[PDB]
Design a protein around this ligand. Structure first.
Ligand code: NI
Length: 341
């Protein structure tokens, strides 16, 4: 059964609610982004309206085969009326196609649902600037001060310099990048760009990338592995066993692998600066874990909420334990006392 924090009061709308069967009284289902935890339940058999970004729509149609008559793409940054209610979709700075949703309720209440997001000071100059928000449905994935990580920009710089150095020292090294879902494409695109290569990958992954509206994409990716010295592999294969195995298939073209495993936060961010990071090594294989996050740091999230000044906050992540719920309510109260709302 559909939890409360996926329902939108005074509307017939749900958010990210495809795994509960038919939802009693839902006339339109919103999808914030194409990640498996949020889309779970959509298929060719779905026959209710789905509202989403254009990118999320290309994915539903081509990867899940949802029938075109039920896909309703909306432009960003644009007031739209859906079943008598004004809505706006805003960029969430998460993965390609990911949105937040503003709902302007018949009774005068204004609700922002963030979906999954990486809060940024640029969001302070979107359509949110105008006005009040009575309820915030907040992605609280990293709502604790111990969660610190660098900017995306610094992490890409480290990856670019690391790869360029290794291949310049050794023209016969292969670079491998792990992936399991959409998001974090900048890691493998930036490395391929500095090395003058296309990124090689499986037919299924190429298909997914082709749905993402990345300009000049045909110039950047390929299914011909032999013509590429940056390869994409499923994340689970990014280990010494998986990588040795891959090296055999390449036909004695290469004598070294350097691989990158993009992660979220890990405990070694407590102690090690991005500059100081070092790989796990076995023979001619090296593996770098790099903390490329598509979710707000604690500091980013605090800044966004203190700017927005919402009347009430409903968390959508870490809601399963009394301790988590209690801890999150305590941070929301300090933030409110500190900033004066
Ligand atoms: Ni997500």
């Amino acid at each position: 059964t559909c939890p409360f924090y996926k329902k939108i009061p005074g509307t017939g709308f749900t958010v990210d609610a495809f795994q509960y069967g038919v939802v009693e009284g839902c006339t339109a289902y919103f999808l914030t982004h194409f990640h498996s935890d949020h889309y779970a339940g959509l298929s060719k058999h779905f026959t209710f309206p789905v509202y989403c970004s254009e990118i999320t729509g290309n994915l539903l149609k081509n990867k899940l085969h949802v029938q075109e008559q039920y896909i309703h793409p909306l432009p960003l940054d644009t007031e739209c009326i859906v079943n008598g209610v004004k809505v706006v979709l805003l960029d969430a700075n998460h993965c390609p196609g990911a949105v937040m949703i503003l709902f302007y309720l018949p009774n005068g209440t204004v609700i922002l649902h963030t979906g999954d997001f990486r809060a940024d000071p640029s969001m302070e100059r979107s359509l949110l600037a105008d006005q009040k928000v009575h309820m915030l449905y907040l992605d609280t994935t990293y709502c604790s001060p111990e969660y610190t990580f660098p900017s995306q920009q610094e992490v890409i710089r480290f990856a670019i310099n690391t790869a360029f150095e290794a291949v310049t020292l050794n023209p016969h090294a292969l670079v491998v990048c792990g992936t399991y879902s959409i998001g974090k494409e900048k890691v493998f695109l930036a490395i391929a760009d500095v090395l003058g290569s296309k990124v090689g990958m499986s037919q299924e992954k190429y298909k997914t990338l082709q749905c993402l509206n990345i300009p000049e994409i045909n110039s950047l990716i390929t299914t011909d592995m032999c013509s590429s010295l940056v390869h994409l592999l499923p994340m689970m294969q990014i280990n010494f066993k998986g990588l040795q195995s891959h090296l055999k298939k390449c036909g004695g073209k290469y004598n070294q692998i350097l691989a990158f495993r993009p992660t979220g936060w890990t405990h070694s961010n407590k102690f090690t600066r991005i500059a100081d990071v070092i790989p796990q090594t076995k023979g001619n294989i090296s593996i770098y874990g790099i903390p490329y996050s598509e979710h707000s740091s604690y500091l980013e999230m605090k800044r966004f909420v203190q700017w927005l000044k919402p009347q009430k906050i409903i968390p959508t992540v870490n809601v399963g334990t009394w301790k988590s719920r209690s801890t999150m309510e305590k941070y929301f109260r300090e933030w409110k006392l500190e900033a004066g709302y």
